[PDB]
Write a protein that binds this DNA or RNA. Structure first.
Ligand SMILES: Nc1nc2c(ncn2[C@@H]2O[C@H](COP(=O)(O)OP(=O)(O)OP(=O)(O)O)[C@@H](O)[C@H]2O)c(=O)[nH]1
Ligand SMILES: [Zn+2]
Lengths: 135, 97, 62, 246, 476, 112, 87, 560
RNA sequence: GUCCCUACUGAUGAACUCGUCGCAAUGGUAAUUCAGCUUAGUACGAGAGGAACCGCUGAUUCAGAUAAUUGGUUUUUGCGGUUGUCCGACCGGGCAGUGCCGCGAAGCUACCAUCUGCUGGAUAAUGGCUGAACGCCUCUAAGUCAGAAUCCAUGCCAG
RNA sequence: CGAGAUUCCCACUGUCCCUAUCUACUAUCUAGCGAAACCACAGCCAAGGGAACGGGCUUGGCAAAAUCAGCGGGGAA
């Protein structure tokens, strides 16, 4: 199966292609570079945008020398762009954060720093498992 | 506007009346979603030409409450009673009384 | 994906119409017509029973 | 007796469910396969509560509790608290707690006797945990991982622990708990035991991708089946473990 | 993993028809004499280049997709060699390369010719001539395509074993009962028809043995030929027996019903003995029910015991007809195989040095059992109900209701609506199916729920009565 | 559904009203309006701001004490359903509402 | 834009023509097919969703809903149409 | 997206010793007293052969092309005579010495060497690298340095911006010219060469001599003298060699077998190189990552250094290897020529080099100063022709399998097969890892695609090499055991494999289909193959630190 | 070696007495794809793996709408603050082609928000029924059944 | 107020866009005055019209006054 989440409601996607977001897990990366969003449609002149709970291709531009300049899938966990939730609640995060994930769903890291979105936690079970704060 | 969940005796019209329309005292129809036209305009309701093909129809609806805060601003007081109770007494009202 | 006008989808929609929405809309219109009725009840030529005349591009002028 | 079941298609039955001695909580789903598997394993001996916490699917990782009580976070609503209270019998206490660590199942792992908490847990939260759950609490990490509930699981008969835990760490952990412990893997080697499975005193539910050797070692450690396995069975078929896990 | 994902290859006429169909259909086709000569040559050279490209891509897919004989495990290389002559396969897959390369050579040749073409008829005849060259090349390639299609079909319909994994081979003379044994031990369909060469190919099944996978292979059989002359079926049999690192079972029967003398089986087994010397081998006396191990002659017993004398051989009895000992023999042989595998695994990592491997450290970490120093066992809460309820059985008619059956009766996944009200437990039953007030006068009814609120209201009313006596609302 | 209390502005924020912003250490703020959202973003002190309910509270302008104010508290232990309990709660809600109205009036009366 | 709605024309009548009514069969009981009101505005509601198979099933859902003020309508006439080869 | 986005970052390391067609103390070389004192303070007591051979030529003012590995002292070799020629700061406006280096790190290293060796002199040295302020570089040029150390692109940009006159430059140095050409600086290098006056002394220091570099030197240098690091191509007699014919599906397991038994490497972190010093040279960076991860899973102390690796990361890895914190070093070719490699004891080439001379360089990387070294090769059927080109280049007799009882592993090229039992067990464990952990499987797929691309992009062998490769494959020695496994082994496998040789040499009588039109085609085909005979924000009153922030704003306003 | 005519659309429009409610010839015509649950770890399968129908729920693109709620925009110059200048000073002013800074209604908006997107017949490849040519046979010759996102119309827009 | 403790950014470019600032250029209606270029006669479309010649002509499609605003079709080497 192609790496596109299934069963996701609409939201205000706020992470375009080529975005410097900060890293969440203890893999060692300091930031991830959104370069390609998996599952985005094919529209000309439209920059693919991603939201919480979507696996996005990421490249470590700043990080530990072991993990630097490395491309692997990663899923968005926190977005500072305001989005609404089916209980009619508009919310947004302080930063833009994602955790490095393999295409099946095994996260390279072990602990997730900071809070975790309910959308990411619900769409991916182990993010809920290894996430210490989800709100 | 009162629903079984909240026994708050109020009409469908929020605080201050509808903006640019007024206050309704009649039978009214509350329908989901955005609907073509603007305020004061005649709206023609009619039956569907064909029998329905989804559970969205013949899905029974149970309501909780209806937003009655003033739409003329970013108000959060549904009823004048709760508003005059929460704000307390004001000097102009005290001088009038 | 099958088109909205596909024969299979049309047949399934007809089955749904005849088996599911049918009785619900029937009972709905039954109570509606009942309330309609509640609200509603809430010489031949000289009498007008025989229909007469009131008060030509089909035939050529004569 | 451990059965392999899928919530929808995910093997993290521990993530989508919390199971204790006197009750078991199942998430609301489009289907009743998962609830039906639990009732099949438990034909109405204890209540099965179809619960949602804070409008979330992840009840297993968003609640933590034992027989004596259940703990749910601030984020849940009054409707859901009333759901838990009314569904749950009178013998069982239910409490909503205010913690920066919302994942209560993750930061809290507990049994009818003991409990383990996150290193950074608050003192007031610790004392409310203690008096609500009627258990004693230690502070400990599992293989240098802070999420004890996800990375490890408890049962009064025995426990399964993070695979990479050192021998000395496992020994001290087993001594402080007072129950037998074994380090092993679940869900075809998934490192997350607590997320992978949920276990009560007399049965277990795992994912389908769990292999037969780890199913057997789970049986032995948790004293399931006929109780023939206290772990001496694991030592007897060590050879199977050696070949499979080499 | 196998070789089924090998794309089909067409015959000569087919490949010509499809290649010419692509070059006809996928490109513009109309050109005019009034058009510029440069555009004419561009058109025709584009046609030629497209024909080259499609032919080259198809031949490249074919070659790079067929298996590379001398990079596979010796079992695989010799098995595909006996099934399919390796030298001849290789000369075929050769001709096809040389043919494709000649296609590209002709491609450049006619590209220069078209580039220096001077007229529409020039381009006409040049393109016709080039496409004729490729057509004739495939026409000569007619037979290799058929051969490669046949080898593709079989290599697709070829059993896929794992030489490394725990394996048990079953060998012997034909009609001894190998197929009967393999059907008894595993869930694999092998023809049990009673004629000499019933199975012309290796058959494969699988079993579980204390939660461990084993693969059982049934081989066709071997006669008294001294391996210099053989049928191809016996050759694939001996290749399996020689290159499959596995436990070996040799099935022989005391009754000569198989059609070979006990001396004949003895000679065959001593002939194949060096091929099995490294391994563990198990001679199984089948059909003991019709002819037991006692009644045959004492010197026959003596020679079979002299065969037993060696230390890497074992003797077992079995009767596949009634399944007298199939479970016991499989249990025992696989147990010894498991013990040997454990020994090898220990040695790999116990190699001389003094430092244990990281995998070995992990396996000790896994096998280690934790136990409290105090030696106390916590008291447990198992209830008598779940002690004496009945086990859940799907075929059982007098069954529980099940939420699944309620769902299926009342619709399906998206139809049935679950009702938590039936699961609600309340003091007064008709409490259920009642709405619960939530908000009232803009203040939360739940947040203001509290027991003894009657007494608290009485206290508040006393306080208000005291205030009223104080005149706490008078105007001055 | 539960009527939130606005952090900065104080007022009883309603569903579909206001925005929610939570900060990574783990704390969530519900803002009734963009006005209070922006006032909290700009690092203003709600104590310093005069229109804020909590300033009106700390200044003593809005009454601080009394059993009615101890009645308003977030409850943490749930209770089994009972029509009688809920209906006596509702009549108590009316009774408390008139309590709060009269006592706010008289508190302002002694303020002036 | 869509070709079914172009060229962009003004509405000839401010009211709005119904054009098509539901098909008639004699078997149903009698009923009117239409009604009129006036768009007053919209409000917000929250609802206990009862959509089986939905992610937000049995959860609070916030929606926007139009209010149409609908005073009782008065019957003042009947009309009889005949079917003809010209409609 | 960024998988081979542009190209495999390590392309190849092409060398052309045909560039040879171009043609004991410091006090004995008689340098100035101040330069001698600076050298003594730096600690250069005995000159290494590279500067011992080059400095007299540079003092004699001859153009120099120097074949020298990194770390031999090339920077000192071309700076000492430069300082000895300069001897003072010139009052006339105009730069006199120019050095062009690929990267800013190497430029900084050269700058540090220049400063340390010219401590005391009034020479003005400048650094012009990318990322620095153009205004600062303008100011430095206004201060008029005598020595310039720069990258080609930045130097060209500054020259174009300032209309700089280079007619006063008499000393030109090209540091790491092969790296310059690999990075593609050739166009602006030629532009700078054209801009420079003809009357200049040119030095070009490189580890390798590609054909493009040879052409550039021929076009731009006036009678260049080629100095080489002594016997860099002469294979040391103390080098022992063993080559193993291995299949692709068993090849990782064969590498593990060599590491486990042939070397008897300890597993785990080790308790100045080590006693084992296992280095592995591969073809692609994907191969480097795959092998490194597999070996760390196996339990080795592995440091990996590949071509396009981050500078700090490569320094940390090289430091770990040189200090003995790791025992294996995994490199292809580019990082190998880039980094400083100490004396090694074990060298293994995973992917066989295309060029015998690349092989010679990789085997001269070990067995130095009379110390014995070991070299193991993994050679496939496709890699055999390159092995044959290598044996022609080395002039060593070929021993296939066990044709000789005691072949000389140092003087004779000995090729054999590895032990079947341990080979199969390592293959099994490799397959188990590949099936279990998905990351390694993804690495396997990407390194397989990279290997396929490398097969397409690799330089081809000779027709005759292909020929006697066919006859070697026909010969029995290809499948026989290597001579290192023991005469008792030879005994057992000779007792056995002979009937196994008969099995492998089976000519089937008829195909199974012969056992239709397809069958008729097969029969006719058979008859045919019948063999031939920033100020703070304005203070807000409501803000808590209102007065403090107002004070900060006032202080910033006063500072301006 | 260099500004003309007119088709078309929209908005108007003279006379047919003015107005209301209608009909519909004609012209255009609109929906597309993917995903998840169940079926189901089932059919199949030596293993590995592994479907489809029915039913349900979402998402992409396109199209027509709308501002309940959330961001954005402030000749509402609304409220608060504030910079320097001169009129000797207060004063109120010119002042900075509307001074700047905070919050801000209404309106307008947003792939930065929400809603909606529909049914009958006839067909093409093909699969058939009956049955001649041709005493067997045959989907075809006569008669005829099913069948594609196809076509034609309804639903929709103009009138 | 706490040496208070912790977190984010700062580079260059002979690269692109936007916003901010400067200079310059930009303005409508009604009254009154009031030209010039150009003009054989007029301009719907399709096919045909030997000579790449169509606005005439043949056969058709069709064809309803008059304004304002957009819009696209024609005019040898
Ligand atoms: N009575 C008896 N007959 C057996 C037994 N095992 C095999 N047979 C006979 O074997 C016959 C079938 O041959 P297989 O079972 O296939 O023996 P095989 O060694 O596989 O040889 P093939 O027939 O060529 O496949 C049956 O008809 C049986 O009569 C046994 O245990 N008892
Ligand atoms: Zn506010």
């Amino acid at each position: 199966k192609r790496g596109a989440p299934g069963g996701k409601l609409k939201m205000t996607l706020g992470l375009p292609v080529g975005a410097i977001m900060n890293c969440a897990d203890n893999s060692g990366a300091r930031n991830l570079y959104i370069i390609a969003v998996k599952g985005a449609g094919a529209r000309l002149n439209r920059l693919p945008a991603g939201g919480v709970g979507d696996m996005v291709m990421a490249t470590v531009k700043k990080g530990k020398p072991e993990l630097r300049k490395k491309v692997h899938p990663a899923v968005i966990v926190r977005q500072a762009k305001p989005w609404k939730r089916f209980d009619g609640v508009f919310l947004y995060f302080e930063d833009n954060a994602g955790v490095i994930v393999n295409p099946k769903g095994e996260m390279k890291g072990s602990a997730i720093t900071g809070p975790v979105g309910k959308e990411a936690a619900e769409l991916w079970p182990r993010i809920a498992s290894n996430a210490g704060v989800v709100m | 506007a009162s629903t079984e969940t909240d026994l708050t005796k109020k009409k469908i019209t929020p605080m201050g009346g509808f903006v640019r329309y007024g206050e309704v005292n009649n039978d009214y129809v509350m329908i989901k979603g955005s609907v073509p036209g603007v305020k004061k305009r005649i709206m023609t309701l009619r039956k569907s030409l064909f029998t329905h093909t989804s559970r969205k129809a013949l899905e029974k609806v149970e309501l909780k409450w209806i937003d009655t805060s003033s739409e003329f601003g970013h108000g959060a007081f549904q009823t004048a009673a709760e508003k005059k109770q929460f704000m307390g007494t004001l000097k102009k009202d005290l001088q009038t009384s | 994906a099958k088109s909205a006008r596909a024969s299979r989808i049309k047949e399934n929609h007809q089955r749904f119409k005849k088996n599911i929405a049918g009785p619900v809309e029937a009972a709905r219109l039954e109570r509606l017509s009942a309330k309609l009725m509640a609200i509603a009840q809430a010489s031949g030529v000289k009498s007008g029973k025989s229909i007469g005349r009131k008060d030509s591009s089909i035939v050529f002028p004569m | 007796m451990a059965v392999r079941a899928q919530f929808e298609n995910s093997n993290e039955v521990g993530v989508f469910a919390t199971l204790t001695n006197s009750y078991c909580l199942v998430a609301l789903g489009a289907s009743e396969n998962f609830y039906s598997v639990f009732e099949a394993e438990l034909q109405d001996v204890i209540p099965i509560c179809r619960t949602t916490i804070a409008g979330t699917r992840i009840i297993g990782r968003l609640t933590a509790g034992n027989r004596k009580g259940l703990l749910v976070p601030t984020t849940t609503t009054d409707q859901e608290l009333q759901h838990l209270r009314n569904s749950l019998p009178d013998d069982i206490r239910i409490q909503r707690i205010e913690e920066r660590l919302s994942a209560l199942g993750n930061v809290i792992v507990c049994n009818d006797h003991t409990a383990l908490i996150h290193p950074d847990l608050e003192r007031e939260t610790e004392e409310i945990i203690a008096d609500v759950l009627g258990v004693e609490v230690f502070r400990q990490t599992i293989a240098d991982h802070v999420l004890v509930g996800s990375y490890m699981a408890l049962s009064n008969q025995g426990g399964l622990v993070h695979p990479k835990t050192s021998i000395q760490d496992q020994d001290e952990l087993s001594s402080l708990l007072g129950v037998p412990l074994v380090a092993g893997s679940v869900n075809r080697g998934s490192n997350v035991i607590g997320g992978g499975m949920v276990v009560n005193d007399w049965l277990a539910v795992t994912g389908l991708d769990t292999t037969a050797p780890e199913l057997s070692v789970i049986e032995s450690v948790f004293r399931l089946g006929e109780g023939a396995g206290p772990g001496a069975i694991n030592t007897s078929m060590k050879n199977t473990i050696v070949e499979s896990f080499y | 993993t196998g070789w089924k994902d090998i794309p089909p290859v067409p015959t000569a006429q087919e490949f010509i028809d499809i290649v010419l169909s692509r070059t006809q259909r996928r490109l513009p086709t109309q050109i005019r004499p009034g058009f510029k000569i440069s555009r004419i040559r561009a058109f025709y050279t584009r046609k030629v280049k497209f024909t080259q490209e499609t032919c080259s891509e198809k031949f490249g897919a074919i070659i790079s997709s067929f298996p590379v004989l001398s990079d596979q495990h010796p079992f695989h290389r010799d098995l595909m060699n006996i099934l399919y002559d390796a030298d001849h396969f290789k000369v075929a897959l050769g001709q096809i390369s040389t043919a494709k390369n000649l296609i590209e050579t002709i491609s450049r040749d006619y590209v220069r010719l078209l580039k220096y073409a001077q007229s529409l008829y020039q381009c006409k005849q040049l393109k016709r001539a080039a496409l004729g060259r490729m057509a004739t090349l495939i026409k000569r390639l007619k037979d290799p395509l058929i051969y490669l299609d046949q080898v593709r079909q079989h290599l697709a319909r070829l059993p896929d074993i794992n030489p490394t994994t725990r394996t048990l081979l079953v060998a012997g003379f034909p009609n001894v009962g190998k197929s009967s044994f393999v059907r008894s031990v595993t869930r694999a369909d092998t023809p049990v028809e009673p004629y000499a060469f019933t199975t012309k190919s290796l058959f494969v099944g699988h079993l579980d043995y204390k939660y461990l996978r084993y693969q059982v292979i049934d081989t066709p059989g071997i006669l008294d030929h001294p391996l210099e002359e053989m049928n191809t079926i016996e050759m694939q049999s001996v290749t399996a027996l020689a290159h499959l690192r596995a436990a070996v079972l040799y099935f022989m029967d005391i009754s000569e019903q198989c059609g070979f003398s006990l001396k004949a089986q003895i000679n065959l087994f001593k002939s194949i003995k060096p091929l099995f010397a490294n391994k563990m081998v198990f001679i199984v006396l089948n059909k003991m029910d019709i002819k037991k191990f006692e009644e045959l002659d004492p010197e026959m017993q003596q020679e079979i015991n002299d065969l037993t004398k060696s230390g890497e051989v074992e003797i077992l009895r079995a009767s596949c007809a009634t399944q007298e000992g199939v479970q016991e023999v499989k249990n025992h042989v696989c147990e010894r195989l498991l013990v040997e595998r454990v020994s090898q695994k220990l040695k790999a990592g116990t190699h001389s040095n003094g430092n244990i491997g990281t995998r070995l450290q992990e396996v000790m970490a896994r096998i280690h059992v934790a136990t409290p120093m105090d030696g106390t066992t916590r008291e447990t809460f198992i209830p008598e109900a779940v002690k004496n309820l009945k086990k859940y059985d799907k075929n059982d008619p007098n069954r529980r209701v099940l939420a699944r059956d309620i769902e299926e009766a009342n619709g399906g996944a998206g139809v049935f609506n679950v009702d938590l009200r039936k699961d609600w437990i309340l003091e007064n039953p008709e409490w259920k199916y009642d709405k619960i007030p939530e908000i009232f006068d803009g203040k939360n009814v739940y947040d203001y729920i509290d027991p003894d609120i009657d007494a608290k209201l009485q206290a508040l009313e006393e306080e208000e009565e005291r205030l009223e006596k104080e005149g706490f609302y008078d105007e001055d | 559904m539960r009527i939130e209390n606005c952090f900065f502005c104080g007022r009883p924020a309603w569903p579909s009203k206001g925005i929610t912003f939570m900060r990574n250490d783990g704390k969530a703020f519900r803002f009734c309006r963009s006005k209070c959202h922006k006032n909290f973003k700009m690092k203003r002190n709600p104590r310093k701001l005069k229109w804020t309910k909590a300033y009106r509270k700390n200044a003593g302008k809005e009454m601080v004490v009394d059993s009615t104010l101890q009645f308003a508290a977030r409850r943490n232990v749930p209770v089994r359903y009972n029509r009688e309990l809920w209906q006596k709660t509702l009549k108590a809600m009316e009774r408390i509402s008139e309590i709060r109205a009269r006592r706010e009036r008289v508190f302002y009366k002694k303020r002036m | 834009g869509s070709l079914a709605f172009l060229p962009r024309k003004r509405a000839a009548r401010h009211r709005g023509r119904v054009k098509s009514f539901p098909k008639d069969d004699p078997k149903k009981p009698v009923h009117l097919t239409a009604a009129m009101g006036y768009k007053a505005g919209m409000t917000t509601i929250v609802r206990d969703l009862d959509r089986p198979g939905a992610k937000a099933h049995k959860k609070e859902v916030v929606e926007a809903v139009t209010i149409i003020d609908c005073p009782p309508m008065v019957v003042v006439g009947l009309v009889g149409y005949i079917e003809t080869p010209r409609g | 997206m960024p998988k081979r986005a542009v190209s495999p970052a390590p392309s190849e390391n092409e060398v052309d010793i045909a560039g040879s067609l171009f043609a004991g103390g410091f006090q004995a070389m008689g340098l100035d007293a101040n330069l001698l004192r600076a050298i003594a303070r730096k600690g250069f007591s005995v000159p290494t052969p590279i500067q011992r051979k080059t400095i007299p030529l540079i003092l004699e003012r001859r153009d120099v092309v120097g074949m020298a590995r990194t770390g031999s002292g090339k920077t000192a070799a071309f700076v000492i005579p430069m300082i000895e020629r300069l001897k003072a700061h010139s009052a006339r406006f105009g730069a006199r010495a120019l050095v062009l280096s690929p990267s800013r790190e190497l430029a900084l290293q050269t700058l540090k060497v220049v400063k340390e060796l010219g401590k005391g002199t009034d020479l003005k040295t400048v650094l012009l690298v990318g990322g620095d302020s153009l205004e600062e570089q303008f100011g430095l040029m206004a201060t008029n340095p005598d020595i310039i150390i720069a990258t080609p692109g930045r130097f060209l940009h500054l020259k174009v911006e300032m209309s700089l006159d280079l007619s006063s430059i008499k000393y030109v140095v090209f540091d790491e010219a092969d790296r310059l050409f690999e990075m593609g600086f050739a166009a602006q290098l030629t532009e700078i060469l054209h801009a420079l006056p003809p009357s200049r002394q040119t030095l070009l220091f490189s580890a390798t001599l590609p054909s493009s570099l040879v052409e550039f030197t021929r076009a731009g240098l006036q009678d260049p003298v080629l100095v080489r690091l002594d016997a860099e191509t002469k294979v040391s007699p103390d080098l022992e060699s063993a080559f193993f014919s291995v299949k692709s599906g068993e090849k990782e397991g064969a590498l593990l077998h060599i590491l486990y038994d042939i070397i008897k490497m300890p597993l785990g972190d080790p308790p100045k190189p080590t006693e084992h010093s296992t280095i592995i040279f591969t073809a692609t960076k994907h191969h480097v990552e795959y092998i490194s991860n597999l070996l760390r899973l196996a339990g080795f102390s592995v440091s990996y250094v590949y071509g396009s690796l981050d500078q700090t990361a490569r320094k940390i890895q090289v430091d770990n290897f040189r200090r003995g914190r790791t025992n294996i070093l995994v490199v292809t070719d580019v990082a190998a020529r880039g980094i400083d490699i100490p004396v090694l004891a074990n060298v293994i080439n995973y992917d066989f080099p295309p060029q015998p001379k690349i092989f010679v360089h990789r085997v001269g990387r070990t067995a130095r100063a009379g110390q014995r070294g070991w070299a193991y090769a993994l050679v496939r059927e496709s890699d055999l022709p390159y092995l044959l080109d290598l044996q022609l280049f080395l002039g060593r007799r070929l021993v296939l399998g066990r044709e000789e009882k005691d072949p000389s592993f140092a003087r004779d090229i000995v090729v054999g097969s590895l032990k079947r039992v341990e080979l199969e067990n390592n293959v099994e464990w490799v397959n188990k890892v590949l099936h279990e952990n998905e990351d390694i499987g993804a690495l396997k797929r990407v390194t397989a695609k990279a290997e396929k691309l490398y097969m397409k992009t690799r330089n081809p062998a000779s027709s005759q090499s292909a020929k006697r490769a066919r006859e070697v494959i026909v010969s029995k020695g290809w499948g026989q055991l290597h001579a290192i496994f023991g005469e008792e082994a030879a005994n057992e496998e000779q007792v056995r494999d002979n009937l196994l040789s008969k099995i492998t040499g089976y000519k089937p009588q008829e195909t199974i289909f012969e056992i239709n039109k397809a069958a008729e085609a097969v029969r006719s085909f058979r008859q045919r193959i019948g063999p031939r005979k920033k100020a703070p924000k304005e203070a807000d009153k409501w803000r808590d630190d209102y007065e403090v922030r107002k004070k900060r704003v006032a202080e910033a306003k006063e500072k301006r």
